[PDB]
């Protein structure tokens, strides 16, 4: 499939292939690292922000071959959203109402349902 994909791509020519790629479609989802995780260990517990992974795994959960990889990405997305939803319950993040991961909710929930 990909062999014939590159076949057709080259056979087409630049004037149409350029149309493969505005606002620049980059928003840097959250201004805060409000999602975090202190990794367990025996000596120290460095804290890791999981926000940056959230967009990537999204498309990895959405568009990816090798069904094992697809399901693994969906499982990891399951785990990460499942944890982060509970983090807000611990300490109520302030705002106009309760926007603890409001922007993250907007980014995630629609495509979550789509999948």
């Amino acid at each position: 499939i990909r062999i014939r994909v590159v076949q057709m791509l080259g056979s087409l020519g630049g004037q149409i292939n350029k149309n493969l790629l505005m606002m620049k479609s980059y928003v840097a989802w959250d201004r805060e690292k409000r999602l975090s995780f202190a990794v367990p260990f025996r000596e120290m517990k460095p804290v890791i922000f999981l926000d940056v992974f959230l967009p990537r795994v999204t498309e990895l959960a959405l568009t990816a071959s090798d069904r094992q990889t697809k399901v693994a990405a969906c499982e990891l997305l399951h785990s990460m959203v499942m944890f982060m939803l509970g983090k807000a319950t611990q300490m109520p993040e302030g705002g106009q109402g309760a926007p603890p991961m409001y922007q993250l909710y907007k980014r995630t929930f629609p495509v979550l349902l789509r999948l």
């Binding site: 990794v39 120290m44 460095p46 804290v47 940056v52 990537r56 795994v57 990895l60 990889t69 693994a72």
Partner: peptide, 25 residues
């Protein structure tokens, strides 16, 4: 299970954990 599958997530994880462990040590 996924880090070996995609290099980009592996790089993000590796950089994040390096930064965290340096800020921890």
């Amino acid at each position: 299970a996924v880090a070996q599958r995609d290099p980009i997530i592996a790089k993000q994880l590796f950089s994040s954990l390096f930064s965290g462990i340096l800020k921890e040590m």
